Write an enzyme that holds these catalytic residues in place. Structure first.
Site, PDB file in Angstrom:
ATOM      1  N   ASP A 190      -0.459  33.671   3.653  1.00 46.23           N
ATOM      2  CA  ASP A 190      -1.354  34.243   4.700  1.00 46.23           C
ATOM      3  C   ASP A 190      -2.718  34.252   4.101  1.00 46.23           C
ATOM      4  O   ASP A 190      -3.333  35.299   3.816  1.00 46.23           O
ATOM      5  CB  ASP A 190      -0.898  35.664   5.032  1.00 46.23           C
TER       6      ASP A 190
ATOM      7  N   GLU B 117      -6.370  34.287   4.739  1.00 46.41           N
ATOM      8  CA  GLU B 117      -7.275  34.637   5.852  1.00 46.41           C
ATOM      9  C   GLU B 117      -8.736  34.548   5.347  1.00 46.41           C
ATOM     10  O   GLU B 117      -9.259  35.540   4.720  1.00 46.41           O
ATOM     11  CB  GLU B 117      -6.930  36.050   6.389  1.00 46.41           C
TER      12      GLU B 117
ATOM     13  N   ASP C 243       5.622  32.833   2.245  1.00 40.07           N
ATOM     14  CA  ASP C 243       4.684  32.767   3.345  1.00 40.07           C
ATOM     15  C   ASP C 243       3.282  32.905   2.782  1.00 40.07           C
ATOM     16  O   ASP C 243       3.018  33.850   2.010  1.00 40.07           O
ATOM     17  CB  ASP C 243       5.029  33.907   4.339  1.00 40.07           C
TER      18      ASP C 243
ATOM     19  N   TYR D  23      -3.421  37.563  17.961  1.00 38.96           N
ATOM     20  CA  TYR D  23      -3.805  39.004  18.146  1.00 38.96           C
ATOM     21  C   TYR D  23      -5.132  39.200  17.377  1.00 38.96           C
ATOM     22  O   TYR D  23      -5.653  38.267  16.777  1.00 38.96           O
ATOM     23  CB  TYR D  23      -2.713  39.985  17.641  1.00 38.96           C
TER      24      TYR D  23
END
Ligand SMILES: C[n+]1cc2c3c(ccc2c2ccc4cc5c(cc4c21)OCO5)OCO3
Ligand SMILES: C[n+]1cc2c3c(ccc2c2ccc4cc5c(cc4c21)OCO5)OCO3
Length: 575
Positions: free
Chosen positions: A292, A294, A290, A370
Site C-alpha cells: 500500500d 500511497e 500487500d 473512498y
C-alpha cells in the site's frame, strides 16, 4: 530390562518448545526481539535412579520414533531437533540387550508461527453479522488494524471470519525515512525508532510488538508464559479454525509510505524484498504481501515526496521482484503466495503507474474507492460514490468542463467508476480488481441550509470545519466517524434519523449522507443501499469482489451488505 525413564518436567522447560524466540517484557530493535529457527531445539531431562539405566534412549511422538541417543548413567538429557510444530504425546524409552522400558506418555508442545500447536480460535463475533453462502471465488476482504486492540477494543476474535476471504493486517512499516508517522502524534514515530534500532534501512519491522505478539489475551487462552501471544497468535489460531482464509500483511498505508519513494534505487528494493522473504519465513500464518504505497508520484502524507516519472517504473519493478521472491518461497514450501496492492483511483494517481505492466505480477488490486472528499477542506462531496453526484458542475464528471472561476478541470472527478474505467481501459483485467467500501464516514460542520446552492442537496453547501465528536461516538480523529457511530448517533435502528439528523441519498451517485441542518453537521459514508449498488456494479463488470476499510468500525451491516450485493455471483479467480 532397564529402569523406565522418569521425565523431569521442570528440568525440560515443562515440555514447551518454540521455533520462535520472542522477547517479552521489553521493547527493543526488531532483530533483537525476534529470532526464528528452522528446527526447534528439544531438550528433555530424564532420570533412572533405581536399577539399570541401559545404553540407548529412543524418543517417540504419538508412537513414532523421532530421536535416539546415548544413556549417560542415572540422569540423561535427550537433545534433538524437530521441524514440525504441534502437540504430541511423548514417551522416552531406555534400551539395552535385555529389553526396553518406556516412560509414561506426556504432552509436548512445539510452537510454530503457522499455529500448528494451537486449537481453533474461540470467536466472539457481534451477532448482527449474518450468514451467507457467497461463492468462494468472490473476494470479501477487510483490513484489521494492529492498534484496534486499544481504545477501539476490537480484537481478532471479534472478526466475522466466516464472512471474509482475505484479512489485510494494517500495517507493517519499513525502516527509513518516516516523518509522516509524526502526523498521528503519540508514540508511533518513537516506537518505530525503537523497532528500527539495529535494523538496516528499507527492511520491514513490526511496529508494535506488544500488540503483535506480547499482550496476553485471556479469550485466547494466553498465559503470561505462553511463547507467542498478541494479535499474531490469535491470527495463527484463526487460521487453524478457517484454513482457507488468506491473511496478508499490508506494508505502508497513508502514514507509513515515506520509504517507498527511495525505491527508485534498485539496491533499496533488493533490501526490502529480502526482508519480506525473511518476514514470511518467520511468520508462517501470512499468505503473501500487500503493498500500500500511497502514492507513486506523490500526493500522499509527504508533501516533499513523489516523482511522477520514476515512481511508476519503481512500483512495477518492485512487483516484478516481489513475485520472483514469492515464487522462491512457493518452491521452498509448496504453498501458494499472493501479491496484492491497494491503489489510489483518482485519475492523477492512476496516471503515474502503467498498471497494464504491473498487474501481470499481481493477484489482486484493492482499488481505494473512498476518501474522494473529506474534512481536510471545506468542500462537501461524496467520499465513496460510484458515480458523479448531482452536486457536481457541468463537465466536472468527465473533466471537460470548467469550475466556478472558469478554470479547466484537470481530469475526471473523483468517483469509483471514473477510476475503475481508467484501469480497465488500459487493460487491467476486471477479475483482478477488488472494489473498496467504507466502514466510516467523513464529515464537516457548518454546512447550514443558507450555504446550499441547491436547497435539496447539502453537498452543494460549504463547511466551516471538520466534524467534531468523541471516541464513544466513533470519532477517533476530527472529520472521520466509524459507521457503527453513524448508526448509533445519527441513523438509529430504523435508518430514518435521530439526534436532529436526516438521512438522504443521491440516487445518481449511489451515495448516502446524514445532515443535521441546525448544527450544519454533514457526513458522507457507505450504507446498505450504496454497498448493494457496489456489489451489483462488481457483478456487472466481473470484478473480483469487494473489500473494506476498516473492520473494527462496522457493526455487521456493511459486511452483510457486501455479501447481499454479491448474491448469486461467481468470478474466475486470477490463475
Ligand atoms: C501505533 N499506535 C499505537 C497506539 C498505542 C496506544 C494508543 C493508540 C495507538 C495508535 C493510534 C493510532 C495509530 C494510527 C496509525 C499508526 C499507529 C497508531 C497507534 O500507524 C499507522 O497509523 O496505546 C499503546 O500504543
Ligand atoms: C490528510 N489525509 C489523511 C489521511 C489519513 C488516513 C487515510 C487517508 C487520509 C487522507 C486521504 C486523502 C486526503 C486528501 C487530501 C488531504 C488529506 C487526505 C488524507 O489533504 C488534501 O487532499 O489515515 C491517516 O490519516
Amino acid at each position: 530390562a532397564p529402569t523406565a525413564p522418569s521425565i523431569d518436567m521442570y528440568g525440560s522447560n515443562n515440555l514447551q518448545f518454540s521455533k520462535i524466540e520472542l522477547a517479552m517484557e521489553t521493547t527493543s530493535g526488531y532483530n533483537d526481539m525476534v529470532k526464528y529457527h528452522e528446527l526447534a531445539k528439544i531438550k528433555v531431562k530424564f532420570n533412572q535412579w533405581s536399577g539399570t539405566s541401559g545404553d540407548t534412549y529412543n524418543v517417540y511422538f504419538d508412537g513414532v520414533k523421532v530421536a535416539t541417543g546415548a544413556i549417560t548413567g542415572s540422569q540423561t538429557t535427550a537433545s534433538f531437533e524437530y521441524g514440525q510444530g504441534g502437540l504430541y504425546q511423548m514417551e522416552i524409552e531406555a534400551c539395552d540387550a535385555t529389553g526396553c522400558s518406556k516412560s509414561a506418555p506426556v504432552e509436548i508442545t512445539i510452537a510454530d508461527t503457522d499455529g500448528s500447536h494451537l486449537k481453533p480460535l474461540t470467536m466472539n463475533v457481534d451477532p448482527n453479522n449474518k450468514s451467507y453462502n457467497t461463492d468462494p471465488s468472490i473476494v470479501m476482504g477487510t483490513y484489521f488494524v494492529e492498534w484496534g486492540i486499544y481504545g477501539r477494543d476490537y480484537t481478532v476474535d471479534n472478526m466475522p471470519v466466516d464472512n471474509l476471504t482475505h484479512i489485510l493486517y494494517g500495517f507493517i512499516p519499513i525502516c527509513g525515512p518516516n516523518e509522516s508517522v509524526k502526523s498521528v502524534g503519540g508514540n508511533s514515530f518513537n516506537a518505530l525508532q525503537t523497532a528500527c534500532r539495529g535494523v538496516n534501512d528499507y527492511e520491514v519491522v513490526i511496529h508494535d510488538p506488544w500488540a503483535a505478539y506480547q499482550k496476553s489475551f485471556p479469550q485466547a487462552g494466553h498465559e503470561y508464559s505462553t511463547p507467542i501471544k498478541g494479535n499474531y497468535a490469535m491470527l495463527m489460531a484463526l487460521k487453524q479454525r478457517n484454513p482457507d482464509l488468506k491473511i496478508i500483511p499490508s506494508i505502508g498505508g497513508w502514514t507509513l509510505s515515506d520509504p517507498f519513494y527511495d525505491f527508485v534505487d534498485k539496491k533499496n528494493r533488493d533490501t526490502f524484498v529480502a526482508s519480506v522473504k525473511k518476514f514470511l519465513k518467520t511468520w508462517k500464518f501470512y499468505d503473501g504481501v500487500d503493498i500500500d504505497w500511497e502514492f507513486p508520484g506523490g500526493g500522499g502524507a509527504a508533501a516533499d515526496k513523489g516523482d511522477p516519472v520514476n515512481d511508476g517504473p519503481a512500483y512495477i519493478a518492485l512487483m516484478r521482484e516481489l513475485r520472483v521472491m514469492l515464487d522462491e518461497l512457493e518452491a521452498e514450501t509448496g504453498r501458494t503466495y499472493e501479491l496484492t496492492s491497494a491503489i489510489g483511483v483518482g485519475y492523477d494517481k492512476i496516471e503515474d503507474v502503467d498498471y497494464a505492466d504491473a498487474v501481470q505480477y499481481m493477484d489482486y488490486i484493492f482499488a481505494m474507492t473512498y476518501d474522494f472528499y473529506g474534512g481536510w477542506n471545506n468542500v462537501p462531496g461524496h467520499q465513496t460514490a460510484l458515480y458523479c453526484g448531482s452536486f457536481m458542475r457541468p463537465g466536472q464528471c468527465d473533466g471537460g468542463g470548467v469550475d466556478e472561476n472558469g478554470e479547466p478541470y484537470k481530469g475526471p472527478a473523483y468517483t469509483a467508476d471514473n477510476g475503475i474505467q481508467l484501469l480497465l481501459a488500459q487493460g487491467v483485467p476486471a477479475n483482478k480488481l477488488v472494489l473498496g467500501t467504507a466502514m466510516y464516514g467523513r464529515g464537516w460542520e457548518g454546512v447550514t441550509p443558507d450555504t446550499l446552492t441547491d436547497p435539496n442537496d447539502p453537498m452543494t453547501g460549504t463547511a466551516t470545519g471538520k466534524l467534531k465528536g468523541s471516541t464513544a461516538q466513533g470519532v477517533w480523529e476530527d472529520g472521520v466517524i466509524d459507521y457503527k457511530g453513524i448508526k448509533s448517533f445519527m441513523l438509529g435502528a430504523n435508518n430514518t434519523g435521530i439526534n436532529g439528523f436526516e438521512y438522504g441519498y443521491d440516487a445518481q451517485a449511489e451515495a448516502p449522507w446524514v445532515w443535521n441542518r441546525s448544527t450544519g453537521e454533514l457526513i458522507t459514508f457507505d450504507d446498505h443501499r450504496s454497498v448493494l449498488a457496489k456489489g451489483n456494479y462488481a457483478k456487472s463488470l466481473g470484478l473480483a469482489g469487494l473489500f473494506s476499510w476498516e473492520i473494527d468500525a462496522d457493526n455487521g451491516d456493511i459486511l452483510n451488505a457486501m455479501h447481499e450485493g454479491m448474491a448469486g455471483g461467481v468470478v474466475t479467480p486470477p490463475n
